[PDB]
């Protein structure tokens, strides 16, 4: 059950990766808009 | 000792989740303001 814990943490990591790429694209769009 | 690493990585995961929610809420407020 160490492995199931690790496996579920990997989906958490994947969700943070997703959130970060979403923010970067949008923040980049904000930075472009203002230049 | 693998368990404690996992416990400690979970504490890091909640910190990164916290930071992401913080950034989402503030980027949204920005995008909303500029419109």
């Amino acid at each position: 059950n160490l492995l199931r814990a690790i496996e579920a943490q990997q989906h958490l990591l994947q969700l943070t990766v997703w959130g970060i790429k979403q923010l970067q694209a949008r923040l980049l769009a904000v930075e472009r808009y203002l230049k | 000792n693998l368990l404690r690493a996992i416990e400690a990585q979970q504490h890091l995961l909640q910190l990164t989740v916290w930071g992401i929610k913080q950034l989402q809420a503030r980027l949204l407020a920005v995008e909303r303001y500029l419109k």
Partner: peptide, 24 residues
Amino acid sequence: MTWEEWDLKIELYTLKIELLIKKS
């Protein structure tokens, strides 16, 4: 995938790990 889904899933998976942590 949307932020509503993302958020739901954070909770789901957070709960799981914590359960499973207590158990191993």
